[PDB]
C-alpha cells in the first residue's frame, strides 16, 4: 500500500542522508511526514531530492522547514498563485471572511480554528477558514470524534464560545451551524443594505 | 437488552457494547442461529415482540 506515517518517517530519514538539514533534523522530518499524507515512496524521494536541487539559486546553506513546506505545497498544488489585488471588493471580501470567521469562533461545539487567510493557492479559491487537522489533534490529545462529543460535553470553551452546565442537544448543536453560514449575508445586509448583498455570500444560504 | 432478554422466543444477546474502544457507537448484538425460524411462519406474537 501507500506508505503510512512511520513508513514516511523511515523513507524520509533514509533519503535525507547526504543533504544538509537546518537545525534539528528530527523536527523537520516530523513536520514533513505529518504534511505529506497519501504520498508514495518515490514522491518522498523526489521531495527530498528537489529540496537539495534548491538551496543553490537561493544560496541557502541548509534545507529548512519553510522551504520544505513550500515544495510540499508546490508538488501537489502547482503554482503558488498570486494574492487578490487590493480593491474595494477585496475589502468587502475581507469583511465577509472576517464575519464568517468570527461567527465560526463564536459557535459553541465547534473544533478550534487553525487559521483564517485572505490569500490562498490554486486558481478557483480565495479566502478560507482552515480548522485544526489530525497533526494538530494529535499534539493536544483529543478524541477524533470530538466534534460529535461537543454536544454533550459541559463547562468547556472552544475558540470564543463557552458552554456551561447545560449541554447542547443535537438539535441546538446542528442548528448552531446556521449562524456562521448566515453571517456572511448578515454582515453585508447590516453594513450596506439589501443592495449590498453579493454573490460572495450566496453559497452558504443554499446549504442552510 | 432487557426487553430482548424478557421477550419470549427472541434471539440470545451476544454482546452489549457502549462506546467499546472510545468510538462513538453503541450496539446490542444477537446470535444468528440457523435453526428454528429461518423462514417458515411469522407469528403475529413474534412480530409484536420484535416491534
Amino acid at each position: 500500500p501507500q506508505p503510512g506515517p512511520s513508513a514516511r518517517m523511515a523513507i524520509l530519514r533514509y533519503h535525507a542522508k547526504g543533504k544538509p538539514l537546518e537545525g534539528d533534523g528530527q523536527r523537520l522530518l516530523l513536520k514533513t511526514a505529518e504534511a505529506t499524507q497519501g504520498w508514495s515512496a518515490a514522491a518522498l524521494a523526489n521531495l527530498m531530492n528537489e529540496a537539495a536541487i534548491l538551496t543553490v539559486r537561493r544560496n541557502v546553506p541548509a534545507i529548512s522547514l519553510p522551504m520544505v513546506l513550500e515544495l510540499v505545497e508546490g508538488l501537489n498544488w502547482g503554482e503558488q498563485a498570486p494574492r487578490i489585488p487590493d480593491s474595494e471588493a477585496k475589502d468587502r471580501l475581507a469583511l465577509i471572511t472576517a464575519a464568517k470567521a468570527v461567527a465560526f469562533a463564536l459557535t459553541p461545539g465547534l473544533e478550534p480554528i487553525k487559521s483564517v487567510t485572505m490569500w490562498s493557492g490554486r486558481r478557483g479559491l480565495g479566502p478560507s477558514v482552515d480548522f485544526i487537522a489530525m497533526e494538530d489533534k494529535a499534539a493536544m490529545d483529543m478524541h477524533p470524534e470530538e466534534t460529535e462529543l461537543m454536544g454533550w460535553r459541559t463547562n468547556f470553551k472552544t475558540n470564543a464560545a463557552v458552554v456551561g452546565d447545560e449541554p447542547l442537544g443535537e438539535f441546538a448543536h446542528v442548528a448552531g451551524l446556521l449562524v456562521p453560514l448566515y453571517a456572511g449575508r448578515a454582515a453585508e445586509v447590516a453594513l450596506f443594505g439589501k443592495d449590498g448583498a453579493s454573490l460572495a455570500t450566496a453559497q452558504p444560504l443554499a446549504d442552510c | 437488552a432487557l426487553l430482548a432478554y424478557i421477550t419470549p422466543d427472541y434471539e440470545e444477546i451476544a454482546r452489549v457494547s457502549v462506546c467499546p474502544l472510545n468510538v462513538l457507537t453503541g450496539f446490542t448484538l444477537f446470535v444468528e442461529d440457523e435453526d428454528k425460524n429461518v423462514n417458515a411462519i411469522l407469528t403475529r406474537s413474534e412480530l409484536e415482540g420484535r416491534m
Binding site: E34, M134 | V23
Partner: peptide
C-alpha cells in the same frame, strides 16, 4: 452519515500520528 468504517479509519489515522510523533476487530460490526 459517517459510517463506523470511516470512524474506525479516523481513529486509526489519529493513532498512527501518535506513533509517528512521540515514538480493531470492529469492522465486522
Amino acid at each position: 452519515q459517517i459510517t463506523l468504517l470511516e470512524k474506525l479509519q479516523y481513529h486509526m489515522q489519529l493513532r498512527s500520528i501518535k506513533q509517528l510523533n512521540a515514538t480493531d476487530t470492529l469492522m465486522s460490526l
